[PDB]
Design a protein around this nucleic acid. Structure first.
Ligand SMILES: [Cl-]
Ligand SMILES: [Cl-]
Ligand SMILES: [K+]
Ligand SMILES: [Mg+2]
Ligand SMILES: [Mg+2]
Ligand SMILES: [Mg+2]
Ligand SMILES: [Mg+2]
Ligand SMILES: [Mg+2]
Ligand SMILES: [Mg+2]
Ligand SMILES: [Mg+2]
Ligand SMILES: [Mg+2]
Ligand SMILES: [Mg+2]
Ligand SMILES: [Mg+2]
Ligand code: NA
Ligand code: NA
Ligand code: NA
Ligand code: NA
Ligand code: NA
Ligand code: NA
Ligand code: NA
Ligand code: NA
Ligand code: NA
Ligand code: NA
Ligand code: NA
Ligand code: NA
Ligand code: NA
Lengths: 194, 56, 119, 46, 81, 65
RNA sequence: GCACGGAGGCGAAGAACCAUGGAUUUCCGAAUGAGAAUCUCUAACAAUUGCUUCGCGCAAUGAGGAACCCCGAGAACUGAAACAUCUCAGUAUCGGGAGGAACAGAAAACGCAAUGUGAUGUCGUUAGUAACCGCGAGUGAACGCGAUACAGCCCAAACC
RNA sequence: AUACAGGGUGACAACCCCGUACUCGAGACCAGUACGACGUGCGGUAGUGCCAGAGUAGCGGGGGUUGGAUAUCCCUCGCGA
RNA sequence: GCUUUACUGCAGGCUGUCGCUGAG
């Protein structure tokens, strides 16, 4: 039979419909009154979190992040430039908003490592994502067989290196075949043409 | 007034001083920032890829 | 609050929580929103309990309508830890389901009526 | 000018570094202080 | 641990303070206060220190001018070393 | 030289401290004599006094005092 | 000690010297109680976090490093015999950061179309081919193949 | 001479000295790897629409990037299984 | 370097539209 979770999931398929529609209109008011990075006791999308690797365990933290919407907040050239590069308004960053969030959340927690993340909506100018972060030093995590991999030294500052969930997707690493020529094994190693 | 020799006389102000961090005489005592190691500005040491040739 | 469409008077709730404690000793009860959901789906649920201080509300939003299309009765509890305690848990509990009462099939049945009347 | 206790200390070192290579080192090495500093011709740091 | 007294500062002018004013001059560690110099001196030479004047020298050390009570004699205390 | 490692460990915590303060004073009187341009020197010692002291401190730590 | 002077000393209680391990290891410095051009003022994980006996009690981060590695920001001289798209070039340079290596990685792949191949890097080749381009100047892969080395697994959920 | 590599030594040194060939020993890396062992239990048949990751897949507006041309990879605004 | 009704672009201002965005 359907898991209770299956219902949360189901409501977040159409966030502008039914009850969740009214919850958002509610929360988003308290959300806009909160800081950029706010730690929360429980994920607003439980199926989503658990699906991403979340557990109700010591050493596991979740947080909401607000980032501005739109393109790049870019300054106009102060020196010579050819028309092609005189651009400002239509320049958009190459790192999606979800990925900025994950980072701002990570910095707020210097000892923690990003496990994954998910969007929790947006209004006219914010974009919210909740980020799951793990304490790689807390035993209970060091002793958990499904998370202890994040404890490894080789994982220090995952987000900042794009080893995150959205990190790899944004890096054009989804497909294993056609289209990932200049993507795999790394953008930089591919002359940065993807 | 000449910008040359005569304007050189009024130079008795102290700016750059021995740096607590790096030991170079570049700690601007008015800005309290070192122009050599960046002490007073950056926790990390001031350093740039243009202090040497591109491929070196 | 968004899933709550009627208010359960303090007293009613007490009889409800009482009925719940004898159930766990005399009959059967399911503790936890997932197990409870499976009771309503499976039909093995007689009376389901839903806390009103659940955040995020998503965790329970479905109980109400689900219950109604499954004919299963449900009653609101204010505190999440009380329903936990009443269920016999040392932690709180968002929802609980009395899967076949015990030495309370009467009191219970009547609570289900009282609420049906509470509209 | 008004010097500090630290400043005074270094000026002190500099005055010491301003001595000449002892006559016995000449003999011992079978044969110049390249850091000789004159107060007027040169300029210390700080 | 650094010691307060380094050694006696014997010079022509250190002699006159000694012979004429019952004072003993020392080369001390610059982190030493007039207080620490006083006690260290009394405990080492078994005398009564009346006053301690200090100066941070262009030599990188701190000089201390210690006067002894009329009861002790500088010339003598210094003579045994 | 005149003070060996065995001999130092054959002392009681108190003897080392007694001996230490002893050496410190010999040394201090050596530097006073030197500070007075005193020639009755014997350079091999004022240097031995520093090493001795270091041995004494080194053993004190090893022994737990 | 380099360092061959003078004086004096240490070594058969086995010194010098060499290896490993230990002790000491001022002040400033990420510099962290606060301030300061290396000093000063009256107990200190400052700041940001995790756990929490909710007490800094137990921990984490911060800075460095020859280049190498990953993620972001991103020119112009120059070439086109001018020059705008294009080129130089994702180069220089900037921001954030990992390790002794990084990164990638067990197919919603390939598509010598097949009764076929079988994670990923890298090397050789495929090929200056296909593809792009004021179709100008220029730019430019992949599948496959021969090699190197080989390795395959863990959740979420259902049911408890 | 299993040693005729190289160096030093008051000038051109296999045999003056260091060393060199031979044999032997130690530390480091390989690697907490390979091997071995302990526990776990693999797999197959039939029935069963019980489960299997959403602002995703997909479309549209505008950019960037690419050899990617309709057929690169990515960002952003809107829509959306 | 400067100028302009030189060529091509860029900020910025004005304006329509979409999102934030809801009831009769
Ligand atoms: Cl991270
Ligand atoms: Cl094939
Ligand atoms: K150009
Ligand atoms: Mg590589
Ligand atoms: Mg001028
Ligand atoms: Mg002088
Ligand atoms: Mg004074
Ligand atoms: Mg401080
Ligand atoms: Mg040209
Ligand atoms: Mg042409
Ligand atoms: Mg190109
Ligand atoms: Mg291919
Ligand atoms: Mg281009
Ligand atoms: Na972090
Ligand atoms: Na590209
Ligand atoms: Na001068
Ligand atoms: Na002295
Ligand atoms: Na040391
Ligand atoms: Na710390
Ligand atoms: Na604490
Ligand atoms: Na030309
Ligand atoms: Na020209
Ligand atoms: Na072109
Ligand atoms: Na073939
Ligand atoms: Na688009
Ligand atoms: Na000009």
């Amino acid at each position: 039979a359907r898991s209770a979770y299956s219902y949360i999931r189901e409501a977040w398929k159409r966030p502008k419909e039914g009850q969740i529609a009214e919850l958002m209109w509610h929360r988003m008011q308290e959300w806009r009154n909160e800081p950029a990075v706010v730690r929360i006791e429980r994920p607003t999308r439980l199926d989503r979190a658990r699906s991403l690797g979340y557990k109700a365990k010591q050493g596991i933290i979740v947080v909401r992040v607000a980032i501005r919407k739109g393109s790049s907040r870019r300054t106009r050239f102060n020196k010579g430039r050819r028309s092609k590069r005189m651009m400002v308004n239509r320049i958009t960053r190459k790192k999606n908003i979800q990925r900025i969030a994950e980072e701002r959340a990570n910095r707020k927690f210097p000892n923690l490592r990003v496990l994954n993340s998910y969007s929790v909506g947006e209004d006219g100018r914010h974009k919210w994502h909740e980020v799951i972060l793990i304490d790689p030093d807390h035993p209970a995590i060091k002793s958990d067989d499904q998370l202890s991999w994040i404890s490894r030294t080789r994982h220090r500052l995952r987000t900042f290196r794009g080893l995150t969930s959205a990190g790899r997707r944004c890096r054009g690493l989804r497909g294993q075949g056609k289209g990932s020529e200049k993507v795999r094994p790394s953008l930089r190693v591919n002359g940065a043409k993807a | 007034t000449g910008a040359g020799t005569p304007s050189q006389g009024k130079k008795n102000t102290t700016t750059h001083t021995k740096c607590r961090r790096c030991g170079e005489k570049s700690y601007h005592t008015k800005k309290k920032v070192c122009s050599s190691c960046g002490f007073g500005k950056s926790a990390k040491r001031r350093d740039y890829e243009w202090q040497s040739k591109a491929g070196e | 609050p968004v899933y709550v469409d009627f208010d359960v008077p303090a007293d009613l709730e007490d009889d409800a929580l009482e009925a719940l404690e004898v159930a766990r000793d005399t009959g059967a009860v399911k503790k936890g929103t997932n197990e409870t959901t499976k009771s309503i789906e499976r039909g093995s649920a007689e009376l389901v309990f839903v806390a009103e201080d659940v955040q995020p509300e998503e965790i329970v939003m479905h109980i109400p309508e689900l219950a109604d299309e499954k004919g299963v009765p449900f009653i609101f509890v204010e505190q999440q830890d009380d329903l936990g305690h009443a269920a016999g848990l040392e932690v709180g509990s968002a929802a609980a389901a009395v899967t076949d009462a015990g030495a309370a099939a009467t009191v219970l049945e009547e609570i289900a009526d009282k609420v049906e009347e509470l509209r | 000018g008004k010097k500090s206790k630290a400043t005074k200390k270094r000026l002190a070192k500099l005055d010491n570094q301003n001595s000449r290579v002892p006559a016995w080192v000449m003999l011992k090495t079978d044969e110049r202080n390249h850091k000789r500093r004159h107060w007027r011709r040169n300029d210390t740091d700080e | 641990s650094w010691d307060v007294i380094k050694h006696p500062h014997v010079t022509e002018k250190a002699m006159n303070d000694m012979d004429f004013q019952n004072k003993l001059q020392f080369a001390v560690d610059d982190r030493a206060s007039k207080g620490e110099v006083a006690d260290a001196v009394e405990e080492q030479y078994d005398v009564t220190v009346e006053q301690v004047n200090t100066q941070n020298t262009m030599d990188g050390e701190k000089k201390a001018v210690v006067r002894l009570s009329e009861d002790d004699d500088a010339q003598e205390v210094a003579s045994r070393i | 030289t005149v003070l060996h490692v065995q001999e130092i460990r054959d002392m009681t915590p108190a003897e080392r401290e007694a001996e230490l303060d002893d050496l410190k004073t010999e040394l201090l009187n050596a530097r006073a004599v030197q500070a007075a341009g005193g020639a009755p020197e014997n350079p091999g010692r004022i240097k031995e006094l520093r090493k001795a002291i270091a041995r004494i401190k080194t053993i004190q730590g090893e022994e737990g005092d």
